Amino acid sequence: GRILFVEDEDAVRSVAARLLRARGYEVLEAADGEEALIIAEENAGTIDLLISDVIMPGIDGPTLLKKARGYLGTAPVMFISGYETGVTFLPKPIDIKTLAERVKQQLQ
């Protein structure tokens, strides 16, 4: 499954991305919404899931969704934070077992 994972905190993003790759997903990482929007455009219609932090330097995750939803098609979207159809919310700190369960549910 091709996941676009948008998270400004490098160590949080990298852990989650590596653990998702260990489960067989392709994970395209972005550190901000402006990078994510370019990735979404260049991969339009091939992304299966967007996972995004809510509050990030630059545009927030929900604004990214508004800009990127067309490139994402019907892909589900999962927002994450320590604080439109197919939109879910997972609190931080992220538990990998729960993250993997939710990714699987949204993709199946």
Author numbering: 571 to 653, 665 to 689
Text from the published report:
In contrast, multi-step phosphorelays comprise at least one additional Rec (Recinter) domain that is typically part of the HK and acts as an intermediary for phosphoryl-shuttling. Here, to test for distinguishing features of Recinter domains, we analyze the structure and dynamics of the C-terminal Rec domain of the well-studied HHK CckA (CckARec) and find, quite unusual, its active site in the active conformation and indeed no allosteric response upon beryllofluoride modification. Rec domains of HHKs are intermediaries in phosphorelays in that they shuttle the phosphoryl group between DHp or Hpt partners.
